[PDB]
Amino acid sequence: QPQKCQREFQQEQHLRACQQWIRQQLAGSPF
Amino acid sequence: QSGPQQGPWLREQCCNELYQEDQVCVCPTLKQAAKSVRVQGQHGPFQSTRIYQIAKNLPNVCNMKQIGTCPFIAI
């Protein structure tokens, strides 16, 4: 339970390039 | 990634963020992300528990399953 980890994460600026998968990833259920 | 025919090294930028630091915050970097992702909002139901592990750098972020990977997030 490293604080720096969780910190650095947000403290920085949640990557964006990942925003793609990170987000799109949500998908996973074809109609 | 329809009609694939290129191999950019931009994704690295994603890892570069984590890599630059201590891998110590690799899979644990995304995990926390999912925390936000999941949150119904636009994805009512989900598997924060599963989606967590399953996830995947992208894949791309870096390209090393020997380090770790998980679901990330953005601002």
Curated annotation (Swiss-Prot), chain A:
Domain of life: Eukaryota
Protein name stated in the entry: Napin-1A small chain
Span covered, complete protein: 1 to 31 of 110
